[PDB]
Design a protein around this ligand. Structure first.
Ligand SMILES: *[C@@H](CO)[C@@H](O)[C@H](O)[C@H](O)COP(=O)(O)O
Ligand SMILES: *[C@@H](CO)[C@@H](O)[C@H](O)[C@H](O)COP(=O)(O)O
Ligand SMILES: *[C@@H](CO)[C@@H](O)[C@H](O)[C@H](O)COP(=O)(O)O
Ligand SMILES: *[C@@H](CO)[C@@H](O)[C@H](O)[C@H](O)COP(=O)(O)O
Ligand SMILES: *[C@@H](CO)[C@@H](O)[C@H](O)[C@H](O)COP(=O)(O)O
Ligand SMILES: *[C@@H](CO)[C@@H](O)[C@H](O)[C@H](O)COP(=O)(O)O
Ligand SMILES: *[C@H](CO)[C@@H](O)[C@H](O)[C@H](O)COP(=O)(O)O
Ligand SMILES: *[C@H](CO)[C@@H](O)[C@H](O)[C@H](O)COP(=O)(O)O
Lengths: 223, 223, 217, 217, 216, 223, 223, 217
């Protein structure tokens, strides 16, 4: 399972990449607007993320019409080969995915909330599809059940579109995604950081330290 | 999963093909008769649909006897190589499917209401079998359970006949067909258009448009 | 399981009542506005249904504020004892239900789309809660799964609010509702008409008639 | 589970009542007209069965309209207190069942092929409902699934209508009915006889006889 | 679950009755023809079993016809109030069970091999029904599955007939009967003795012994 | 299922109670410290919540020793009959619950993370037990599974201690709690507010409004 | 679920009783022999445990023959009315249980390793049956599955013998026993103390203490 | 499934190796510090184990920082080709594993307590991951459920990291690990010793010996 960071905060992205556990980044207009404050331009933020991340970087069109979408997608693709164009699940978005797929431009279909929307995006040729589990949780439906159905459907037809679980809110979204077999999760930085941690890991490290001081007062392994 | 349009309405077909999510079309005598009004003749309708649709176009015979069915089927086949001849599940229909199968004329067995009818159509060599889920629902049995049994039977024997779910009435027939792994669904136009829609998709677009306007007064992505 | 008719069409209601299988009626503002045309007044339509139907008849408030809902609910209640006041699942609606329940005015909470909304309506004291299965099907979620969860939740807490399955589109919504154990279904007229029918019933009647004609022409 | 005989053949009925495992009888116009031959009349056949069978005896109306159904039913009822009026699942039949139940006349709703038809018959007050499992098998659906759903639905609503499994064709329809918990099965005579039999029973009787002769010639 | 001994052997019955865990006895014509050899008469063997065993003791008729079975059953009844008359699953057996039930004579229907035979016996009023699990195992059918179905059917109809699992061959027939909830099992003596034993019981006794010898 | 509000913010508590959907409140030292800023005293905050909430109000001891715990619990009980004393799962806490139970003071055992801790608190006589589902989610275990086991255990022994699901983070914690059959959930205000809402409720209200304007231009129901 | 302490160590028993979560005590000849050293005699140990523990105290006979077991059991019964006589699953033990049952002397059948042994002990009238889960685990079969089958058998026949899970080695034997619905567990002291503990409980205490110090410098709740 | 011995006790390791059933050894700082007493030096203990054991031998770094872990790992690797460097699941540990994996130094990620930590270690390229089942049991969670999830996750993504079940306390951890399909278990000596044994094995040997003594005294 690939793990992407879902943010536009450059500091978070730098830190996650240095742990070596971040395989890419997803952005959206809200995440970018959060960082385009106090002089910082959205164009510079996007270019910078593409620079520092070796994996895929998803960047969303802002046009809602077919022609604006494919025009902006070709501009986004032009910025770096790791750019992936995020496109919403709409009539015009499906048309844009089909065109861009034929042009060998990688695409990510976003704002997906049920399995048949995800299948429609796969049939248009999309590279990734992003179902939003946290926003389903918000409206009182267990969002992970949609991921489970998409995985089954994609397995049934040997679909090569990658399932990219998005709107992740907690580590159990991540655990359940891995058990189901989703291709990718994209996670906020706070969630990323929590995935490495466990209180028994902490306790065990402290007990090992104390036992080793019995045999080596300076606490080193001299071999 | 392939998605066919279940209509003889030229505008619906043109619209859905323009969307890029329609892989073919199924008709029947009732659907054609509803459009063959105010001067239009059934032969114009069929030829025009064959022209618009690149994928399979299923066209039903009206004869009930073997010789008439095979004669009709060869005429239908002559209208275009994407024509598929729709034949009912009857003794003379099975005989006709076996004859036409040997002539490499593609066939679609219709009016199928249980799994063993579907198996017999596959054994006659039919290209597609069309169980009618909505008409089973009408008589108080869950039609999707027949699709599930057909999928299992066909998997058991590596049957190459495609399961073409028909009499579809709502998007959950479509969801369940995909989770089962049916090869094709054929859907009325009202159903097709609904498949792309979700209220959280609309809500999410509106929020992203608002976030975009905070960083770009005009509303145009400049990269 | 009680079976209600989901329409404001007086002709449908008369026909279904004469068949003996209709236990009540549900309406909503769209259903009424469809009939209240070409001179027909919405007040008359509501009053006519209340007179024809012995069982519960649900009529929806149109106000969105607490005070306006309670005022409208009292006028609806005053139209006949079988009137039930349909109230949407909103903050003001839950307050209104709580007040009307203490006034012993029967209530039906509508526009419910998940099980926790249904639970909230039950906690407000509502007589019926109406989850919409067909509108969930519309958006690619099997609506009957919400009915199954509400039945479990209501059984857990011995909740006396009745589950009234609404937005029904086909007879398998009805079948699944009965197997789950919902208290009520409300069905459109073309669904109601199909529930008595089966092709093997028709075939068996024809065979029995031919058999009888051999012994008594 | 009660066990009824599904026949109009008086010799079968007498033989099976002589076994003491038959709790009642069902008939239909086809079964009666098979035995109404060689100058035998359908009225005498019915009266003879009623006399010989202590249990319920189901006898089908031949009218298709409500008023004819109800007049026939009362005449059937007047033939003996153990008569049960068999009425088809139709709009007129449900109306007739509702009337007859209020008159304390026992009823059996027949030609039922799915669980919601069975529910409608129970809501009309019917004493027994008869889903036809074998005719469902004939058209490629496992008929016993319908029995299982009706048992669940009736349990959900504490329905007192008895499930009377009909159109029975083999002993596994009977076994599955008992495991599900159907109230009654009605079986043809050749199925009834087979229910007592098993090859290991016969083989065991032979070995016990053979061992018995060892110690007692 | 009640536990009966399935034998005509006076020594086995007496030993198991000494252990305090045997609740009743079943016999059959083959079991009794094995003990009625070299000067033993079947009549004495039955009376001695009846006398030793407080609980129910089933004794099978040998007649095949209704009249003979009912007359034999009354002779069996007259032998002791704890006598239970074992009657095979046949037409005349079902008629005899019904008559004997009306006379308040306890009955045990035997040679039952599927659940619907068991149900018919219950409908005739029988006190116990004895499905034969080992003989089903013999012909390649897991006989405990018939017990499970009979339990479900009897539960469905609140049937008061007791399920008496017979033809028991091993301790897992016994375990599965208890997990299903059969009312009674009847077991041969080899099987009965084995039910108390386990090698970890033996090992634990020796270890407690050794530990106690360090203190006394 | 009772629904408590998990906050010490007086405004949130006032608002939730007026919806009539709030059955009580839980607090803890962190939630109270958040509101004891800029002159406001913790004692006044506690007394005020007890005043405005008719249902149970859980207030946590801060002593870690048996004697300090029962002393503070008797003070908390003295403030109002709706006070419930929150006591942590520790050796001294169990001893305190047993004493206070014998004094007919209602208790809530908190900081519970597995089912056997919850059983121990029930055996001491505690009125409520509070397993922390969100903090289990944080450490990569699905916290709702512990609620399911506690419900089973309590059912097995007819335990009268109420299960009060705490550390709730989203509406699916609430949904799963209700399906399991927990006695109580305690929820932050943001979660509470989301429970009433659904996008199809919004859309349906707008459609009903529009249809009614066809028959009543002023949008009233005149009867 | 009742919790007994499985030890003859007086200090452990005193400590665990002081905690209020111990409902009784089980011993055996090995556990007593480990404490009957350095002058202490086995009779002092038993009498002292009987004095400390208000609940049942199980004390094992050492005879292997029926007459010795019943004579020992009457002496044990005379030490105090909370004494329960532990008797092994043997032919003479079953005879002894039946005799003692009639004398209204409470009994505990030990060295039980399968469900039918447990059923036979119940049929002899035993008060408690003690299957040994850890010793089954030692020989490669999951001992808790025997507890599960015993619970089902006893439920089937409304058996009043209490299931007393013994040879407990870890807290998951305890968890599974409670989820199954065993009547009693008996646990070594090391296991008992661990049952209350969880690292997130400790972490949560520490955070609440910190939040408290922000509003109360001394550290005392004043109401 | 490979079976490792989880100890630094040279006598246990010698004994287990001579039995032929030990495929490798795991150690940790507590296990080594227990043996490195009364003159015994930890360097000598590690070197002696590496010589005795043909299979993998895991030895844990004690540094907590990236640079110190990699330096210590290189010294461990240099002690013998069968050495495996045990690295805790921390941020610095994952960086260290990634570097050592690219240097073709085998690694074992330890102190893992849920399935997503195990996945992170696998993504860093670790040769073995060691989830601790017994320490989870300690805190009231069935540790074997984490092994089951990791096996599923690893199967989903065709992960080549081996699952090394650690903190094993009893033979049922071992049984359940094999049924799940874990790659490796590491067991303490008293668990290892019990795996070959069964009381019915012992009893059957005694019976066969008595049988043989009847034909060849
Ligand atoms: C041809 C077979 O695929 C189709 O056109 C079918 O006739 C229709 O799908 C049947 O649908 P209705 O039951 O709604 O007529
Ligand atoms: C009232 C609630 O019981 C009913 O009239 C509902 O508004 C309708 O059942 C909803 O149906 P549609 O989704 O078909 O509008
Ligand atoms: C009356 C309803 O209980 C019965 O006589 C039914 O008509 C028959 O059981 C139907 O059987 P066939 O399907 O074999 O006609
Ligand atoms: C009487 C009925 O309970 C019993 O004696 C049975 O005949 C035997 O249990 C049958 O045993 P076999 O199959 O081993 O003969
Ligand atoms: C008496 C019966 O409950 C207990 O003391 C048991 O002897 C022990 O629980 C057995 O435990 P070990 O297997 O650890 O000796
Ligand atoms: C190394 C990881 O494979 C092992 O030595 C582990 O540290 C131990 O297996 C952990 O065991 P304890 O929980 O018993 O310390
Ligand atoms: C791109 C789609 O993969 C992502 O940036 C999504 O927009 C976010 O993951 C959505 O998350 P929120 O629901 O929390 O905005
Ligand atoms: C009292 C226990 O019911 C509550 O106030 C709990 O402390 C909180 O629910 C814990 O939630 P957080 O984990 O989010 O602090």
């Amino acid at each position: 399972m690939k793990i992407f960071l879902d943010t536009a905060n450059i500091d978070e992205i730098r830190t996650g990449v240095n742990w070596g556990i971040v395989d890419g980044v997803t952005t959206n207009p809200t995440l970018i607007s959060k960082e385009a404050v106090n002089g910082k331009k959205y164009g510079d933020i996007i270019r910078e993320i593409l620079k520092i991340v070796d994996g895929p970087v998803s960047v969303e069109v802002v046009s809602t019409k077919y022609e604006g979408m494919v025009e902006e997608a070709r501009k986004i693709h032009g910025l770096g080969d790791n750019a992936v164009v995020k496109i919403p699940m709409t009539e015009d978005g499906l048309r844009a995915i089909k065109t861009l797929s034929s042009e060998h431009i990688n695409t990510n279909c976003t704002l997906v909330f049920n399995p048949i929307q995800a299948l429609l995006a796969a049939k248009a040729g999309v590279t990734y599809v992003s179902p939003f589990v946290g926003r389903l949780d918000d409206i009182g439906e267990d969002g992970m059940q949609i991921i489970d159905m998409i995985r089954t459907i994609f397995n049934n037809y040997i679909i090569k579109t990658q399932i990219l679980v998005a709107s992740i809110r907690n580590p159990i979204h991540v655990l359940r995604s891995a058990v189901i077999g989703a291709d990718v999760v994209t996670v906020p930085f706070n969630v990323l950081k929590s995935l490495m941690k466990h209180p028994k890991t902490d306790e065990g490290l402290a007990k090992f330290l104390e036992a080793w001081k019995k045999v080596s007062p300076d606490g080193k392994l001299i071999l």
